[PDB]
A paper describes a structure:
A glutamine synthetase-like (GS-like) enzyme (NpaA1) initiates 1NA glutamylation, and this enzyme exhibits a broad substrate selectivity toward a variety of anilines and naphthylamine derivatives. During γ-glutamylation of 1NA, the 1NA consumption (0.16 mmol) was almost equivalent to the total accumulation of γ-glutamylated 1NA (0.157 mmol). In view of the above analyses, NpaA1 was established as a γ-glutamylnaphthylamide synthase catalyzing ligation of 1NA and L-glutamate to form γ-glutamylated 1NA. The crystal structure of apo-NpaA1 and two complexes with substrates or substrate analogs were obtained. The binding pocket is located at the interface between adjacent subunits, and the bifunnel channel similar to GS protein refers to a structural feature characterized by two distinct channels that converge into the common active site.
The crystal structure of apo-NpaA1 revealed that there are six monomers arranged as a hexamer in an asymmetric unit. In apo NpaA1, there are two Mn2+ ions binding to the active center, coordinated by glutamic acid and histidine residues.
Author numbering:
A (entry chain D): 6 to 87, 96 to 495
B (entry chain F): 6 to 417, 423 to 495
The structure:
C-alpha cells in the first residue's frame, strides 16, 4: 500500500474512493481513465480496467515521465537516455475528482498526482504547483475564487490529416486537421448565431451539465465561429481541475460528432480573431467565507484587493510565459484589440491588463486579469494569479492609477514575444522560484526556450511581430492539440 | 437583490418569475436565452443555465455595450477603449450594463432543444436605465401616451422573402473582417410569382411555411393571415391587433421566430426590403394604428358623419405627417429601404393623407361609427427596428394631438418624403426637437452619428450615382442586410 504508507490520502479521499468504486459497480463501468496535466495542459495517462483501478487505489500505477521532456511535437529537449533520463513515477489517483464521461462508452475518469517511488512529490507536476499555491494562500488566511470564462473556436472537420504523408516525425510537426467555420459574423452576441450552431452546441452544453460542471452562459463571441462558455465561481484546486475537464470535454465531444474545438489563441484561418481567457479572481476569508475584495464608498476595491491588483500588475511580466504559454498567444500583445499590451488597471475598460468589476458593497466585486490565453495550463495560469497577487498583498504594492485610456497609458509595457516573456522571468527569477520551485523554473526556462528556437528557424524573427500574420508553424504546433 | 433594490419589477413581474421558474422546472428546460434589441432591432444577448437564470432574477446579468457602438459589420463607430466622464456627452468606452430579465416575455422556443427565452432591459449598474436601449425608448412613448389617457393599438402587416439556401457562405474567404462585409448567403427562390394571392403558391410553400405557422402559433403570437405576395417567393404575414409594449415585443419575436425556424430547415427568411436577386420587388411593413381610451377601452378614432376620422384621429394623422420626414430613418433605417420606386408599382413616397391613393404615406380606413376606424402608415420597411418604428408613430402622432395639427384634405404640390437614408438623416437633424425630447437627446446624436457613417460606407463603396434611389440594388446593400435582417 504505497498510498497508505506514504500518507497520500485524507479520510475524505479514502471514503471518496470507497464511493467511486460503488458508483463504478452500479453504473457498470468497464474502463476508468487516469490522467494528469503535463507542462502544456495536455491530459496524459492510462485507461485502466476496474480490476486495475482497485489495485491503483493501493499501489498507484507506474508511468514514465517522458511527456515532461518532450515538446508538443516530440523533440527531446532533455536527454532521456543517461534533468535527464526517464525515471518511472507513480500515478496516485485522487478519487474526489472522479467523473463519469458521458460521451464515452462505459468509461469513468479521474485525475492523478505524480510521485517519485520514494513518495515525495514529482517537482514538474503542474497540478502540484497549484496545490503549493493554494496551501500557501491557506496559511495567509485566504481562499482563491475563480470564474472561468473561455473563448474558443468551433469548426466542422473536413479532413482529419491521417494520411502517412501528414504524420510528421519527432520534431517534425504533423499537418493541421482541416476545418471549416460553422458560422460567420462579426456581429457580437447575436442570438441567431447561437441557434445556428446549437446543433452541435447543444451536445457540448448537455455534456458539461452531465459532468455536474457549473456552466453559467453560452455566448456568441465576436469573431466568425468564435464562442464563449462561462462558468460560475469555483474555489481553489477545484477550479483548475474544472478548467482542465471543461477544455477536454469540449474538445472530445466536438470530435465524436465530427467537429474541431481549438483553444489555440489565434488560428491561421482568415477571419479568425484572437481568443482570450480572462480570469475573474477574488479572495475570500478561509474562516468567514466572505469576499475580502468588497470595496466601500470611494474605493473600487478593498485595500486587500487593491494589493492583490498591485502584485498582479507588478508580476504580470515575469508571469507572462505562464498566462501566455504559446508563441501564437502573443499576437494578443497588441493595441486596439480588446487585449492588454501593457500593465494597466482600470474599472470597466477592456483595453487594460487588470479590469475591476466591482460596486460598493457588491459581494461579487473581483478582478479580471485579461493577459490570459485560452490554451494556457489551468494550473500554471491560476497559480500564477495566486502567486502574483499574494505578493502584492505581502508587499503592499500600490497598483498605481486607474487608467482612462490604457492604450495611452505610460505604464510599463507587456512582453510581445514568448522569448520576451521568458527573458522577463529570467531577470525576475524569485517568487516563482520560491513558489513554483527552483527546479521547475530551470526546467521551464530550458524547455520553452527550445520551442522559441524552433519557431525562429522555421519562420524567422520578423514573423514574430504580434501584428503579423499567423504563421504555419503556429498552426502546426497548436491547432490540433490545443 | 439588484432588482428589488431599484424596484425594477412590479408585483406582476414578480407573480410571473415564480411561475417562469415553475414551468422551467415542469418542462425540464436547460437553457434560457436572455436577449435584447440593439439599435438595429437585432436580438443580442446570452444563453443562461437554469442555475444561472435563477441568479439573474435577483442580480441581473452583465453585458458590454459594444453592439451599440458597432456597425452591422462591426466597424467601431465610437472609441471603445477610453472610459468616459459623462458618457452621455462624449459617447466612449465599453461600460458593463446589467440585463434585467422581464418575466412577462417568457417563451419556450419550439424549434430549439429545451431552451427558453425572455427579453432584458439594459440598466447602468447605478440602477438607472441605459440611454440607448430601444425598448426603453418604446417604454417612454407608452408612458407619455398613458399620461395623456391613450393606449397604442397596433396592427402588423409584414412582408418578407422565403428562399432555399444553396450555400451558407462559410468558407474562410467569405467571413469578412471587422468593418468588412461578409459574403451573402447564396439562395434560390421557392415559388414563381407575379400572380398575386395565388392559392397554389401558398400550398406550394407550405412544407416549410407550415413549420413557421406552427411555430408562431405555439408562441401564442396572434397570427392573422399568411398571404402570397406579388413578387416571386415573397410572402406577407399579418397579425391581429396588439397593444403598446406587447406589440413591439411580439414584432421582434415574430421576425426572430421566422428566421430561426426557416434556417433550421435549410431556408433563408429575410427582412431586407429589396434583395439583389432577379425579380424580387420591395417588401413593406404597413402598420395600422389607433388610440383607445385607457379606462373605457374604446376606439377614439371612430368618426361621426361628415369627417373621415374623429378630430383626435385627424390630429394624430397630422402629427404622423408633419414629422414623417424626420421619422423616416426610424421607419426606413436601411439604405436599401428606399429602393421602393419601380416601373410597375406605387410607393408611398408622398407625405400625404388619402383613402385610395397608393402614393400617400398614410391610408385611412374609416366608416362612420365603425369601431375599427384607424389609420395605416406604409413607409415602414420590414427590416425596421420594432421599438423605434412603433415609438416613432406614437411620438409623431402625439405631437399632432397635443398641437391639433391639421392633416388637410385627403389626396385622392404634394410634399414629398426623403428618398434616401441620407435625406432621412438630413430631415431628422434639422427637425430634431420632438425626437430629441421624447427619444432622448443622447440617443438622437448617437443615432445621427452612427447612421451618417453607415451612409459614407455605402457611398464609398458604390459611388454617388448608384446611391440614387431609382437604381438597382447594389452589392453593398446585399452584403449589408441580406443575411442579418
Ligand atoms: Mn468575452
Ligand atoms: Mn402588400
Ligand atoms: Mn395594407
Amino acid at each position: 500500500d504505497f498510498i497508505t504508507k506514504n500518507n497520500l490520502w485524507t479520510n475524505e479521499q479514502r471514503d471518496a474512493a470507497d464511493k467511486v468504486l460503488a458508483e463504478i459497480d452500479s453504473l457498470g463501468l468497464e474502463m476508468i481513465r487516469l490522467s494528469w496535466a503535463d507542462q502544456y495542459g495536455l491530459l496524459r495517462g492510462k485507461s485502466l480496467t476496474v480490476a486495475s483501478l482497485k489495485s491503483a487505489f493501493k499501489e498507484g500505477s507506474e508511468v514514465a515521465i517522458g511527456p515532461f521532456f518532450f515538446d508538443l511535437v516530440s523533440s527531446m529537449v532533455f536527454n532521456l537516455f543517461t534533468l535527464s533520463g526517464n525515471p518511472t513515477v507513480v500515478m496516485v489517483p485522487d478519487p474526489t475528482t472522479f467523473k463519469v464521461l458521458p460521451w464515452a462508452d462505459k468509461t469513468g475518469w479521474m485525475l492523478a498526482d505524480l510521485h517519485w517511488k520514494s513518495g515525495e512529490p514529482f517537482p514538474l507536476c503542474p497540478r502540484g504547483i497549484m496545490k503549493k499555491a493554494v496551501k500557501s494562500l491557506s496559511d495567509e488566511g485566504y481562499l482563491f475564487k475563480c470564474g472561468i470564462e473561455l473563448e474558443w473556436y468551433l469548426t466542422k472537420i473536413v479532413d482529419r490529416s491521417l494520411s502517412p504523408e501528414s504524420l510528421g516525425a519527432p520534431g517534425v510537426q504533423p499537418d493541421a486537421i482541416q476545418v471549416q467555420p460553422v458560422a460567420q459574423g462579426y456581429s457580437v452576441l447575436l442570438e441567431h448565431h447561437l441557434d445556428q450552431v446549437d446543433d452541435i452546441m447543444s451536445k457540448v452544453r448537455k455534456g458539461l451539465l452531465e459532468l455536474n460542471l457549473p456552466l453559467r452562459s453560452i455566448e456568441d463571441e465576436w469573431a466568425p465561429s468564435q464562442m464563449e462558455t462561462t462558468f460560475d465561481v469555483m474555489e481553489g484546486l477545484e477550479a483548475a481541475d474544472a478548467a482542465l475537464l471543461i477544455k477536454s470535454a469540449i474538445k472530445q465531444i466536438c470530435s465524436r460528432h465530427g467537429y474541431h474545438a481549438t483553444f489555440m489563441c489565434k488560428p491561421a484561418i482568415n477571419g479568425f480573431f484572437a481568443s482570450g481567457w480572462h480570469m475573474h479572481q477574488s479572495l475570500v476569508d478561509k474562516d468567514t467565507r466572505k469576499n475580502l475584495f468588497i470595496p466601500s464608498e470611494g474605493e473600487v476595491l478593498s485595500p486587500l484587493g487593491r494589493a492583490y491588483a498591485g502584485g498582479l500588475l507588478a508580476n504580470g511580466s515575469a508571469a507572462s510565459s505562464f498566462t501566455t504559454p504559446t508563441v501564437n498567444g502573443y499576437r494578443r500583445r497588441q493595441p486596439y484589440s480588446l487585449a492588454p499590451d501593457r500593465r494597466a488597471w482600470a474599472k470597466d475598460n477592456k483595453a487594460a491588463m487588470v479590469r475591476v468589476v466591482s460596486a460598493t458593497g457588491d459581494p461579487a466585486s473581483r478582478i479580471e486579469n485579461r493577459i490570459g490565453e485560452p490554451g494556457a495550463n489551468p494550473y500554471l495560469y491560476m497559480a500564477s494569479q495566486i502567486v502574483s497577487g499574494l505578493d502584492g498583498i505581502k508587499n503592499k504594492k500600490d497598483p498605481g492609477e486607474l487608467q482612462e485610456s490604457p492604450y495611452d497609458a505610460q505604464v510599463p509595457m507587456l512582453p510581445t514575444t514568448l522569448a520576451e516573456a521568458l527573458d522577463a522571468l529570467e531577470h525576475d527569477s524569485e517568487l516563482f522560484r520560491s513558489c513554483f520551485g527552483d527546479t521547475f523554473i530551470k526546467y521551464w526556462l530550458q524547455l520553452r526556450r527550445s520551442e522559441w528556437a524552433r519557431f525562429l528557424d522555421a519562420e524567422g524573427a520578423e514573423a514574430a511581430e504580434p501584428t503579423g500574420a499567423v504563421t504555419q508553424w503556429e498552426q502546426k504546433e497548436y491547432f490540433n492539440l490545443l
